[PDB]
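Thread: Modeling a multi-component assembly for a lab meeting

Hi all, long-time lurker, first post. My supervisor asked me to bring a structural picture of a complex we are working on to next week's group meeting, and I have zero experience with this. I have the sequence lines for every component (1319 residues in total). Could someone generate the structure of the whole assembly? Inputs are pasted exactly as I received them:
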Amino acid sequence: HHHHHGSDLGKKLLEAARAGRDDEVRILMANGADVNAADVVGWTPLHLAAYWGHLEIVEVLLKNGADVNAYDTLGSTPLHLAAHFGHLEIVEVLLKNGADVNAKDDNGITPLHLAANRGHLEIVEVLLKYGADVNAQDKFGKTAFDISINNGNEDLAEILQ
Amino acid sequence: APPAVTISASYPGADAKTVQDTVTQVIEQNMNGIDNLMYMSSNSDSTGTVQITLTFESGTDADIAQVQVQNKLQLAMPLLPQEVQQQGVSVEKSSSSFLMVVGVINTDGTMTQEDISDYVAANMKDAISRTSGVGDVQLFGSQYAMRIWMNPNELNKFQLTPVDVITAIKAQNAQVAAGQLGGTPPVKGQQLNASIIAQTRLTSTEEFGKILLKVNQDGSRVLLRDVAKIELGGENYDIIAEFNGQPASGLGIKLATGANALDTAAAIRAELAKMEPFFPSGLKIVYPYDTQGVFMTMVQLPAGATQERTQKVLNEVTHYYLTKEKNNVESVFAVNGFGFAGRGQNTGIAFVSLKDWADRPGEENKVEAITMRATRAFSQIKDAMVFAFNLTGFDFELIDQAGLGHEKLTQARNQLLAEAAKHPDMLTSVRPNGLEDTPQFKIDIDQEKAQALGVSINDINTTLGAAWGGSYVNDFIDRGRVKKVYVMSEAKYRMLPDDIGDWYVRAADGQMVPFSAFSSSRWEYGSPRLERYNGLPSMEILGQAAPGKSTGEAMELMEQLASKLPTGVGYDWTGMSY
Amino acid sequence: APPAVTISASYPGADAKTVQDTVTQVIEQNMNGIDNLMYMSSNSDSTGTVQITLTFESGTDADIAQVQVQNKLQLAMPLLPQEVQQQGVSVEKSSSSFLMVVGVINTDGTMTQEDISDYVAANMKDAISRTSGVGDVQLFGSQYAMRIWMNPNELNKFQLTPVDVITAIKAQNAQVAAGQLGGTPPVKGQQLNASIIAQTRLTSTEEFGKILLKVNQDGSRVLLRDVAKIELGGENYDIIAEFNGQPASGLGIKLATGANALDTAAAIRAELAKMEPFFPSGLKIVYPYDTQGVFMTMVQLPAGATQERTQKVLNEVTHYYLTKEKNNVESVFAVNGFGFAGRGQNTGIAFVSLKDWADRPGEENKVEAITMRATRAFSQIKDAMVFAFNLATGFDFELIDQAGLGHEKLTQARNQLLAEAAKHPDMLTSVRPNGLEDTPQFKIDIDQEKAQALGVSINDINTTLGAAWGGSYVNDFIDRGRVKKVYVMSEAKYRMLPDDIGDWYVRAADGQMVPFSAFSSSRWEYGSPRLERYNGLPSMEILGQAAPGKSTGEAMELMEQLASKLPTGVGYDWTGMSYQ
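Re: Modeling a multi-component assembly
Sure thing. I ran the full set together rather than chain by chain. Output:
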């Protein structure tokens, strides 16, 4: 899942996925661009699309064979990014396509932890719906519930029970 | 021209947001009560630098403008971080273009680029900077500092941190006022009066190397040289120059607003003539850019480009002039790390000097045709804007009017640029003037774990910053001249994310705690250059009318597209469009 | 009038004497070798404010005057308390009166006075203050700060103090320069280069709330929200405005010396037109005072008068204009806490705007008859000087302590002079002090010996007292993209009565919590809420008028005779209208 870094169409695809250029993404894929090209921090086009909220590119990439569970150089996946940044529809598409709902980055942090911390409650519900381990602990021993108490987010604590 | 006053400040190791939120906003909030100010703009950069430009109504006296700005800045100075204050803040009333470049090379290759730069900094730059008419002097390189290159493996072996190192340097590279024997008021019958001389600044790597950090329980000594490499080296490493491909430094000189071009240049040559007889052997002045027998080439790469990649582009530019144009071009002085716009790892400039006019007969060998041919030859270089020019469509600012924040302003900017690109009959080359967000390494210090371990947050933040960013500790005396001392990690312990984990901090109980025990990290995006306009977050957009259209029609259309942007996003016209 | 440069500074929680002795004197001692200076005066107030006014000869170039004052000020700057330097000392070259007032209201009632004042401070003031010709801009209200309102019972419960709070805020509301991965000089071949982003300023009450103050031995956490209420709230709470009785804020704008009034006013309106389209809903500009068609009403109660009492008088004023004068008066913008005097809790001002010339026929409906009638109606308001006037042969006298006599003796000499001048109605009318009377103050003595024996540090004592009862500016935070201040202070109910002193605990070196009552004693005394100085010496300004058809020269000649009988060491000088 750590994809290696470097090529000319790969680089265009990384840039197009980041800027949300749907047409150009489509052209590049049809011209053989490596769907899992990675930049120097391990981000693939699916990472980029997920971070920047480009739903249709996320769908295009997965339809062309993108590694749904691509890891960056610190262990983070496209699902981490989409959950952390509030991209509900993207979260659903990724989980629908086999995203590891309990993937931990190098810090032991899971997508539920990120969504919890930013208070993205609909994402939290979807992740739990897909099997997210509600009791998963990061490197500091913290669960989503501990996060809800520290942040004082009563609504989140409610959802977790 | 409307006169402009520039404030410059630096914060070693600071990212753009840090600079903007501890420095730029503070200055801007305090630029009140100044007469005839038309507008103000600022950049805050991930080089740790801020530049604030205040542009005055035409006819304003630039002396009064400068004094009024300096005086407000003075009253704001206590509001700025100590690290910023201690670098020196400057305020200049200068043209933005160069009057001339003084190059310096070593004909006997006795001196490296870094040596030459220090020589210029330490022996030439001040006297030039004091010459009447000289508005701004940029060194193309850096003065030496004393560089303490720390080793985290050796620090941890002796249970030490960068905090212990900084403390020891301040204690042991000190200049102490100690009074006098027989000092006033004296006793009756005193025969002797004499100064007491105690600690004095250190002067050499040898002396820094024997700073005593600690004595082990067993009685052996830990010297600074046992945990660090000690050498003279630049205060920074961002600007490197070459003259016809050989190692160089120099001074770029900007004309003081309202001074005389010819008088100032002659005063400069006269000051250089005083210095030459004392140069070390090999050292020589060259004149690569005297302001129609000169021009510049700008090199602007995307944010993210490294020193190596800007250099490859400048090597192509230089090569072209020394091969294809060698019949017209006498010299090229190329600077990696500084360009039109100022300082960055992704920018460069080449100053090009032509042979005598009389030896370039034919209109094809005149500056206009040479610059056009060069721009054409460089137009195919990948992921670089490269062009040659001597030294107009529109200048638009998009403005955050409602606290929207950087991410949303970027989205609004992108919406406007997408709309502009659907009107190619009316607008051409509608583009940002600034930089795109790039990946950054976000590290979260766990306050709970730090407290549980008895590790101080100030020891954590100093350790992180000093090692990965550098820290200006205090001054020393190099060959008679006051210069700076910096501590920083040796390069090889600050290159990769796993290196974070090799830095240890000492807890209250004496244990060494690695950074990994109390931190976590992730990749995210953020800005390498944050812009503001009249005190609000902004993004500068340039463009021009399409062929057969007036500038005013192009502007009216921009205004119409602007009226459809998200709530809270405004705009204004500046520069040539004001 | 001759050009004036004003220096202003602020010391939060400081009494008049502390301001005078750590700020005013230190600055004043450098105000010499300034060209064309006629005289200098100052006020040092128990609001923690100083204003020094330097008045120059007619025709002095105000840019040069400002430069020369500032250059002398710079000598004092490093000697001033850090708390004062960090508030931002100001040096201005303005007219002393307002060119205009811009009011701001919310027609939907969906913003409080406090919210409106924050909006104005955060989105409008700086651009106005940078407009050419704007000499001085007075906000009628306060910018928000992050307010941490500490609870001393909860602090003591966890063995914490305001020092621990302040320390933690500095540590955990921080903006860290952390360098780069792969920065220069790199290992050659390095491809990765990225900024390291570590702590950044906090942006919200939620983030301040979760600041970690300590971890108990049992593992439980004490967060800042466990010992404090956290909210956005004014840097200060002293200035409150209303427009036709509705919540408001505004900007009072003074013209820069020598600038053009018409041009500056228009540039202000052009700047406001840039702002209007971005207002939140309901927000609106109103124009309650454009310089005739306008006038002001000064309200000045005796020192000691609370906000609530000044408000009562302001209500009587506003009520008069909106009822008795409703056919003449278009609007009243009333400010509680700010007056002709400057800032103070016993002062206020009302700006009145009349309907058009052509809807007020009759000499009885013109400004002079309106102000005369208003002044008459207000003349019987008890314990308040209230008068109405638009914008002569008075005199302006300074009694000066020329021998180190001290404040109390100077007051005795003043009273002696005033009594003498009262027995001469034939030459002198209405001889009175321009300043404030002394008021009770709570004197607290820290016992050094007990503090040392208990191992309680003097700095911890002083920070706990000052931060709790005075408020402390800790550091900055970012509110909706803008740098703003962070303040710690006691929640109101813990700093209301003398007995509250004893509910504050300081932590000793051995970990024991010690109440303030163990190492302190207190008593009531009197002192000044406003200390005046004239040419660098303690002073008391005395105003009055020549009696009907006596010359100002004859009136002044009498005051000089009366002044020559005062105790040794008391002198006098003439200022203002009397100086020439």
